[PDB]
Symmetry: C3
């Protein structure tokens, strides 16, 4: 009737006893890249983030540990601190995830488009994800559609949030709201296929912005506030129907996917100007 999960554990034996390291690259995210790695015993393939090892990261990971305990958050599995070059390293090993940057995955649906109801599902989940962190006092601070990846390529295959190179524990407008901001950011693009455009006004083109419930077009408002305050807290955010919906959302045809195919070329812009938009945002 009473339970916990294990504490975080820094193994010190050269991961090389415990795994076999490829060089086959994966993510080339923040600090160090991401390497295919296979667990010797099990023989399963794995993400490996390489870290300099300094209190910062050393905590950043420290939180991740707690966070992984989440469904929609990427789970860490083992965290060795060894010695690569000549400097006390830090290798955090986590479930690899081959589903792809959420969006990039949708724009190859081809057969059948996307649905406002299916768009929910995505956003819907993302919500939960954020909650947890906040709901324990962590703010992610970088919620890019780069860092929303899927597990497998099987269509049921769920998606998760990663790269804790940014987050903080919300201790003692605030912090845990950029995370909101982004969700907002996310939804927009999730429907048309672009964000706003400042560094202002965000317009609503015909062929996509239509009978598409102005009701939804409401929420997004409270979400997007260039304000810090009044940007609808996640705690808040969850409550609203569309979120807790699953099934009553408009069956609308979503151009979103193909919207992107239409001018796939301007995204390295989008995808990235977002980090610009983000990160720097305090």
């Amino acid at each position: 009737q009473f339970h916990v999960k294990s504490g975080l554990q820094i193994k010190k034996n050269a991961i090389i006893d415990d795994y076999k390291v490829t060089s086959q690259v994966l993510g080339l995210g923040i600090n160090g890249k991401v390497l295919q790695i296979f667990n010797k015993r099990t023989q399963e393939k794995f993400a490996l983030k390489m870290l300099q090892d300094c209190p910062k990261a050393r905590r950043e990971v420290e939180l991740h540990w707690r966070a992984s305990q989440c469904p929609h958050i990427v789970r860490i599995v083992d965290v060795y601190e060894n010695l690569y070059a000549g400097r006390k390293c830090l290798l955090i090993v986590m479930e690899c995830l081959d589903g792809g940057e959420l969006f990039s995955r949708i724009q190859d649906r081809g057969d059948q488009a996307f649905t406002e109801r299916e768009a929910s599902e995505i956003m819907k989940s993302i919500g939960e994800a954020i909650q947890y962190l906040h709901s324990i006092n962590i703010a992610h601070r970088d919620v890019k559609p780069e860092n929303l990846l899927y597990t497998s390529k099987r269509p049921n295959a769920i998606l998760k949030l990663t790269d804790f190179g940014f987050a903080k524990e919300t201790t003692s407008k605030y912090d845990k709201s950029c995370d909101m901001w982004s969700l907002g950011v996310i939804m927009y693009i999730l429907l048309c296929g672009y964000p706003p455009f400042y560094s202002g006004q965000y317009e609503f083109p015909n062929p996509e912005w239509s009978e598409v419930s102005e009701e939804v077009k409401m929420l997004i408002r409270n979400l997007l506030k260039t304000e810090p305050t009044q940007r609808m807290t996640i705690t808040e955010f969850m409550n609203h129907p569309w979120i807790m919906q699953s099934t009553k959302v408009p069956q609308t045809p979503l151009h979103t996917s193909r919207v992107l195919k239409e001018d796939k070329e301007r995204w390295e812009d989008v995808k990235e100007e977002m980090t610009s938009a983000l990160a720097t945002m305090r």
Copy 2:
């Protein structure tokens, strides 16, 4: 010809592999309560203090470890840092102790009263206890007759000091003296059955304060000084006869026990105003 004891060790595997946790409560002291807990292998019952886990506690315990190495100080046995709620916990497991808040144990002697010579024994011991901590540079800072408990209910069964939620290492009037103060505090009540009463003068009623060696009534003085300086250091405190006595102290009948029975009702006052008196005292 050369020796040590082991270092402190933070196990990280969910204590749930290593113990079976009840919910049967015990102490409801400082932070977290105290739970009956049984060691799987041995199958012995145990105290478990639950801690938030922040440098403070995380050190407070850290000292306790060293301290336990003492007879009259409660011994820690294992200290897991896991994850309860959503926050890196800290579970320190120690020998449970069912003898009771020193005093509360005496006021049920009934058959035969207490003896100035037997009162020594108690105080006598408590002294040692303090020494150690100080004698390694730790000040306890909370020495309540709540935190002086006995092991078993068998009359030989000794007593020990606990709850390190307060102490410090005396590094670099001072600090390690409140601990004195309290011993003082303790002895008084240990004889009549009350403390002073300020927030001043401490009087000496007939039916108890009597042929009871004014000699003892001396020491207590040097102990009680509302001063910081000149409150007889423990190092000092030990030297005096009555302490190193065991056997020459007056065989006096002590009302103390029954003294308390006489107005048991005002104690929640006593017992507690002491923490008030204490703690806050710097």
Copy 3:
């Protein structure tokens, strides 16, 4: 095709399970002495440095770990943090080394003297040693001919650098140059058999300072600069011929060894005034 070494590991089980401790003293260096110690399993003899255990040391060692990964640097093998007296100790165990304070070892060659070419070898090596530390951003800060010891007494038997009670990681004239300074210091004495003498001018007596390539007498210059800047960095220092030489250096007879025999008595002065000279030097 990809590799590391293991991370540093603080064992906590009383070393007394893992080794048998003598009392036979060895080094009486910085903090704690040096004890013969034998590894239970292997049954090999070992150095043991005893440390108070405070962040400082606790890091000082922490670096040593990385450093040991070096040939010419003394290797640490195990680092227990236990409880001696009453205070969280720290016992770092390393390969013992019975070859002797570099110099002291040379002044008993007797049969055949020393060679400028053989003097290189020594200095030559020492160079490398320093490089590493610096080459990973550690400055040793104490490079005395006390801390340059040999492994065995067999003449091939190499020598290594020890006592990290002083060093720092060179993070963010500078720091990692005292180490240079000393090398300089070392070479001089390595040839005549004294240093300079200030607290100034360093002269060059006949019977030793002779056809002995003024070319070498050059380098030493750039090394010795009472300056902080322009004291030839090690990175630099290495490049020059004499260093990378091994074999083209003058076959000169070196009085050095016997030079010391000649007035062995003034050395406790030399050997030590060096620490004076050193250490304090910022």
